[PDB]
Amino acid sequence: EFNILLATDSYKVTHYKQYPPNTSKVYSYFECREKVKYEETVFYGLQYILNKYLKGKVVTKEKIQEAKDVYKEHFQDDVFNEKGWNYILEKYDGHLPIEIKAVPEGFVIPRGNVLFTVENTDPECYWLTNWIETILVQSWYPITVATNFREQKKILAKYLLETSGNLDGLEYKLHDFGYRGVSSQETAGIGASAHLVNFKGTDTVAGLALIKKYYGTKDPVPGYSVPAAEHSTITAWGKDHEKDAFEHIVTQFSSVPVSVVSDSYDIYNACEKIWGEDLRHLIVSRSTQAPLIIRPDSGNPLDTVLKVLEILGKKFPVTENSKGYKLLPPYLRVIQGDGVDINTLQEIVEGMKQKMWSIENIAFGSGGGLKLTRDLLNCSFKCSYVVTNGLGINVFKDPVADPNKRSKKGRLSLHRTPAGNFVTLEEGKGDLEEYGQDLLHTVFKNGKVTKSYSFDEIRKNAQLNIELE
Amino acid sequence: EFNILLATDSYKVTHYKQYPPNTSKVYSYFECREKKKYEETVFYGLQYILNKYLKGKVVTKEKIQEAKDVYKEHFQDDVFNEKGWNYILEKYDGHLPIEIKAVPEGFVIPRGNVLFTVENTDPECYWLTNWIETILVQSWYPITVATNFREQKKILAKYLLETSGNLDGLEYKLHDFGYRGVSSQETAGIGASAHLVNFKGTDTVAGLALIKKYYGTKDPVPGYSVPAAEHSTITAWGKDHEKDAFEHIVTQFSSVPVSVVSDSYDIYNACEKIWGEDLRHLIVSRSTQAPLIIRPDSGNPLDTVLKVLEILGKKFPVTENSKGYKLLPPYLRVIQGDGVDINTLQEIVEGMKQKMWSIENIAFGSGGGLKLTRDLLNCSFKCSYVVTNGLGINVFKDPVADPNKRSKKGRLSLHRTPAGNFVTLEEGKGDLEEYGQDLLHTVFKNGKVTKSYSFDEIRKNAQLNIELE
């Protein structure tokens, strides 16, 4: 079972002895510190952490003893604050005397703004604020995943709108195929849930269950998939029977969309001769609700997509839409799921546009051929205010060799500007009442989640301006 | 509770309808595919996955129903092999009819070799081999982390030996500080355990629990830490009292090693004036077993390390070791934990060597200021052999635009070559017995872990040649 006393950076075990004597308050905050890309971030994922790890009785006699014994061996010394943890156990029935304020989940906020704050609600637990830094800082991951997929969606939306005149199906243009490529089962759930803030197509089932348990959606599930082949279901037929494989698969899945990986041996032969000739009769008979989705999975992503489209464009009836772009028939689509990061996504849709192919023809997969870190958005947790001997003091770091690492001073609040933008006020200045109400909400207090958001409101908060029309 | 029926890529749910009819066997393998440097990989982490996710009764009626319900909504269609899963539940008491053979954990194997194979042990469960690809492929992470840290260890060892004449303390030269920068609690444990294959210093406690549970060590713990300050415990004293903070902390931890982050405001002033003058008397009095460890954490990693060393060398008595390199007194050391990836590590030690500073003077920390992916070592799982209508056929992919993605054919085995290197035999050629014993051993069969390795064995297997000498 998870033990919060063992879920911190080792050195933090020793910090209660390092703060100034008679420190009653330690107040800290999280931001995506400022540095033309990633100018605004989606705040998402804290609610998962609050619920899974921080809420309720998180301290017990057994957990304290377990922690004591581990740290004794780990430090080769007795440095563990048994008394402090016993105090939380005895006084608060193991509930953390901590208050956390945060911007609403799904909110899109410019870099360099306070996103959440953490402070102890009991003077005895001054050390607790930064003990939980490590666990809270991991919010960097869902924030960054949600932000990066939103930035990909912006690109897709721009080009889909330009080439088609609408945004129909945008939420299905970037399918998450990343399950095998993440570092653990837990990460798969978190990352997928972050993808699903932006999109609805996913092969990472773990995301659904996390969203259901921690957020909730009006719909039965937040994300969907369709039958698709992998290389093993094609190659198992034998090198000379790729056509037989294709035929079997599209016949098994004749009334639903089906994606068929087409590059096991020769993607271009597969498109021109197998799909485009030998099996063409099975493709042109398919319903608009059940297209064949051809999947290349190798070679230069851009060149391969453009060549596949040209091949298909000559074997199938192509129309020109109202915007002047070429459109495959509705029973035939392409998905490119190899090497698609934000850069190559941009490259492919621009390349298609230059060749007069509608973005309607294509979808993308995120997974193979790819990497986001805590430093991408400079996600950082810092102490900004302490009370020692009853005197509050504004604290910060400001390293001489890196002004970018300067942290904020004093008690923080988030506000609307007269123009309707966000501004973070420092040094308790929000109390001057010149900038209206603090936009942060208390979301955790003394062992209880005090405010939460459904996955539906998170998605609405995370919407693109272009979607808002 | 974890449900294996929900822990695969969604599309795999549909693959039982896509393999050739009358297929009784699907045999698949994992390799770190060669790429036309990371020439050798540490095989590590499968045992964790076998134990946590695959062994024992992993199928129940409730899990089948849970999956049935999820997939019905997720696919908006009833595709789901309920009968196939029922069969495993009824016939094998929910144990997976799968055999996995693997190279021993800790083994260091060149790229392009079979590391493990997977096959169904019952004809009815041909579909199961690749169902579990997703969960098994996540072994990419502990493999890549263990491999990357071993490669960093190689560099450290090379330079430590050159500048000092020995490898003393090598296992403590790269401390894991990466807890807050990974994507989840589970990843933290996995990644830390992989770091610990190579090193002993860690602030990620989760690594210890995982090792104890899944591998085991003679020693009580596989990894250690020491007291250390973070910016909050320094900055909380107020900008005018950094010296007071330093004094408090080193006095609190007078008899053990103590690391003190010294760049809150001005790392160079801190070293020269605070440590080097004001508090020098508290430093030169310390034991060799309890050094002060100065920690810069900002600026150019190389430039800052060299400048810190130059400062300290002028304030403290420096010796010249037998190799002609400068050495700080034993009560004083430096740790650089910002921006230290393999490339920067190399730059720093080479930079130090150029300025005649022994590597004895420095340690490094990983995590913060830096992102390994599945494609780094091209960790891949592919089907190479199937039996259809009683006939075995050797199968593979070989995409025309990317020969690097060609996969191996037929039944595989791993062998020592006459010169003592490694070779993977394809097409069942291992059966000819021309190459000695198959190095792959059955580690999993029909729900049981059949062979396990201790963490001590893994560490021994993963040793550097330089350590062997």
CSV table of N, CA and C in Angstrom, one decimal, chain A residues 337-394:
chain,number,residue,atom,x,y,z
A,337,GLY,N,0.7,7.3,-38.0
A,337,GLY,CA,0.9,7.2,-36.6
A,337,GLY,C,2.4,7.0,-36.3
A,338,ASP,N,3.3,7.2,-37.3
A,338,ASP,CA,4.7,7.0,-37.0
A,338,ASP,C,5.4,8.4,-37.1
A,339,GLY,N,6.2,8.7,-36.0
A,339,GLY,CA,7.0,9.9,-36.0
A,339,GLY,C,6.3,11.2,-35.9
A,340,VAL,N,5.0,11.1,-35.3
A,340,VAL,CA,4.2,12.3,-35.3
A,340,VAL,C,4.4,13.0,-33.9
A,341,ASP,N,5.3,14.0,-33.8
A,341,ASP,CA,5.3,14.9,-32.7
A,341,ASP,C,4.8,16.3,-33.3
A,342,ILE,N,4.7,17.3,-32.4
A,342,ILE,CA,4.1,18.5,-32.8
A,342,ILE,C,4.8,19.1,-34.1
A,343,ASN,N,6.1,19.0,-34.2
A,343,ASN,CA,6.8,19.5,-35.4
A,343,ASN,C,6.5,18.8,-36.7
A,344,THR,N,6.4,17.5,-36.7
A,344,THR,CA,6.2,16.8,-37.9
A,344,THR,C,4.7,16.8,-38.3
A,345,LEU,N,3.8,16.9,-37.2
A,345,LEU,CA,2.4,17.2,-37.5
A,345,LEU,C,2.2,18.4,-38.3
A,346,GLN,N,2.8,19.5,-37.9
A,346,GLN,CA,2.8,20.8,-38.6
A,346,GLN,C,3.3,20.6,-40.0
A,347,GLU,N,4.4,19.9,-40.2
A,347,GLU,CA,5.1,19.7,-41.4
A,347,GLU,C,4.2,18.9,-42.4
A,348,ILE,N,3.5,17.9,-41.9
A,348,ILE,CA,2.6,17.1,-42.7
A,348,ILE,C,1.4,17.8,-43.2
A,349,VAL,N,0.7,18.5,-42.3
A,349,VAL,CA,-0.5,19.2,-42.7
A,349,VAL,C,-0.2,20.4,-43.6
A,350,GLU,N,1.0,21.1,-43.4
A,350,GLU,CA,1.4,22.1,-44.3
A,350,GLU,C,1.7,21.5,-45.7
A,351,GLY,N,2.4,20.3,-45.7
A,351,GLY,CA,2.8,19.7,-46.9
A,351,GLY,C,1.6,19.2,-47.7
A,352,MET,N,0.5,18.7,-47.0
A,352,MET,CA,-0.7,18.3,-47.7
A,352,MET,C,-1.4,19.5,-48.3
A,353,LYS,N,-1.5,20.6,-47.5
A,353,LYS,CA,-2.1,21.8,-48.0
A,353,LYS,C,-1.4,22.3,-49.3
A,354,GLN,N,-0.1,22.2,-49.3
A,354,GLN,CA,0.7,22.7,-50.5
A,354,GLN,C,0.4,21.8,-51.7
A,355,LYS,N,0.1,20.5,-51.4
A,355,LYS,CA,-0.3,19.6,-52.5
A,355,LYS,C,-1.8,19.6,-52.7
A,356,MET,N,-2.6,20.5,-52.1
A,356,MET,CA,-4.0,20.6,-52.3
A,356,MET,C,-4.8,19.4,-51.8
A,357,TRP,N,-4.3,18.7,-50.8
A,357,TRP,CA,-5.1,17.7,-50.1
A,357,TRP,C,-5.8,18.2,-48.9
A,358,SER,N,-7.1,18.0,-48.7
A,358,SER,CA,-7.8,18.4,-47.5
A,358,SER,C,-7.2,17.6,-46.3
A,359,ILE,N,-7.2,18.3,-45.2
A,359,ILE,CA,-6.9,17.6,-43.9
A,359,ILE,C,-8.0,16.6,-43.6
A,360,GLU,N,-9.2,16.8,-44.2
A,360,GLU,CA,-10.2,15.8,-44.0
A,360,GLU,C,-9.8,14.3,-44.3
A,361,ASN,N,-8.8,14.2,-45.2
A,361,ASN,CA,-8.3,12.9,-45.6
A,361,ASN,C,-7.5,12.1,-44.6
A,362,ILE,N,-7.0,12.8,-43.6
A,362,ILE,CA,-6.0,12.2,-42.7
A,362,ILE,C,-6.3,12.4,-41.2
A,363,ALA,N,-5.8,11.4,-40.5
A,363,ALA,CA,-5.8,11.5,-39.0
A,363,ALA,C,-4.3,11.2,-38.6
A,364,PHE,N,-4.0,11.4,-37.3
A,364,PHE,CA,-2.7,11.1,-36.9
A,364,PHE,C,-2.8,10.3,-35.6
A,365,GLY,N,-1.7,9.6,-35.4
A,365,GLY,CA,-1.5,8.8,-34.2
A,365,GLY,C,-0.3,9.3,-33.4
A,366,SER,N,-0.4,9.4,-32.1
A,366,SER,CA,0.7,9.8,-31.2
A,366,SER,C,1.2,8.5,-30.6
A,367,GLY,N,2.5,8.1,-30.8
A,367,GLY,CA,3.0,6.9,-30.2
A,367,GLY,C,4.4,6.6,-30.6
A,368,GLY,N,4.5,6.0,-31.8
A,368,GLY,CA,5.7,5.4,-32.3
A,368,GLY,C,6.5,6.4,-33.2
A,369,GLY,N,7.8,6.3,-33.1
A,369,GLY,CA,8.7,7.2,-33.9
A,369,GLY,C,9.0,8.5,-33.2
A,370,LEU,N,8.8,8.6,-31.9
A,370,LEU,CA,9.0,9.8,-31.1
A,370,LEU,C,10.4,9.8,-30.5
A,371,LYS,N,8.8,12.1,-24.4
A,371,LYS,CA,9.9,12.9,-24.7
A,371,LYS,C,9.7,14.3,-24.1
A,372,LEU,N,8.5,14.6,-23.5
A,372,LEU,CA,8.2,15.8,-22.8
A,372,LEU,C,8.8,15.8,-21.4
A,373,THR,N,9.4,16.8,-20.9
A,373,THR,CA,9.9,16.8,-19.5
A,373,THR,C,9.4,17.9,-18.7
A,374,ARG,N,9.8,17.9,-17.4
A,374,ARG,CA,9.4,18.8,-16.4
A,374,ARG,C,9.9,20.2,-16.8
A,375,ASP,N,11.0,20.2,-17.6
A,375,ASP,CA,11.6,21.5,-18.0
A,375,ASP,C,11.0,22.1,-19.2
A,376,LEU,N,10.2,21.4,-19.9
A,376,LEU,CA,9.6,22.0,-21.1
A,376,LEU,C,8.8,23.3,-20.7
A,377,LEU,N,8.0,23.2,-19.7
A,377,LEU,CA,7.2,24.3,-19.3
A,377,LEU,C,7.8,24.9,-18.0
A,378,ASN,N,9.0,24.5,-17.6
A,378,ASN,CA,9.6,24.9,-16.3
A,378,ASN,C,8.7,24.8,-15.1
A,379,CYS,N,8.0,23.6,-15.0
A,379,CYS,CA,7.1,23.4,-13.9
A,379,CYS,C,8.0,23.3,-12.6
A,380,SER,N,7.6,24.2,-11.6
A,380,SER,CA,8.5,24.4,-10.5
A,380,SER,C,7.6,24.7,-9.2
A,381,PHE,N,8.1,24.2,-8.1
A,381,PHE,CA,7.4,24.4,-6.8
A,381,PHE,C,8.4,25.1,-5.9
A,382,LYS,N,8.0,26.3,-5.4
A,382,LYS,CA,9.0,27.1,-4.6
A,382,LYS,C,8.3,27.7,-3.3
A,383,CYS,N,9.1,27.8,-2.2
A,383,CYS,CA,8.6,28.5,-1.1
A,383,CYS,C,8.7,30.0,-1.3
A,384,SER,N,7.6,30.7,-1.1
A,384,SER,CA,7.6,32.2,-1.3
A,384,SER,C,7.3,33.0,0.0
A,385,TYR,N,6.9,32.3,1.1
A,385,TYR,CA,6.5,33.0,2.3
A,385,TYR,C,6.6,32.1,3.5
A,386,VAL,N,7.2,32.6,4.5
A,386,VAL,CA,7.3,31.9,5.8
A,386,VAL,C,6.9,32.8,7.0
A,387,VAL,N,6.5,32.2,8.1
A,387,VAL,CA,6.4,33.0,9.3
A,387,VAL,C,7.3,32.4,10.3
A,388,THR,N,8.1,33.2,10.9
A,388,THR,CA,9.1,32.8,11.9
A,388,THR,C,9.1,33.8,13.0
A,389,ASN,N,9.0,33.3,14.3
A,389,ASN,CA,8.8,34.2,15.4
A,389,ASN,C,7.6,35.1,15.2
A,390,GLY,N,6.5,34.7,14.6
A,390,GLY,CA,5.3,35.5,14.4
A,390,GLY,C,5.5,36.6,13.3
A,391,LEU,N,6.6,36.6,12.7
A,391,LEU,CA,6.8,37.6,11.6
A,391,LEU,C,6.8,36.9,10.3
A,392,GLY,N,5.9,37.4,9.4
A,392,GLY,CA,5.9,36.9,8.0
A,392,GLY,C,7.0,37.5,7.2
A,393,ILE,N,7.6,36.7,6.3
A,393,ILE,CA,8.7,37.2,5.5
A,393,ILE,C,8.6,36.7,4.1
A,394,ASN,N,8.8,37.5,3.1
A,394,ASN,CA,8.7,37.1,1.7
A,394,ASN,C,10.0,36.6,1.3
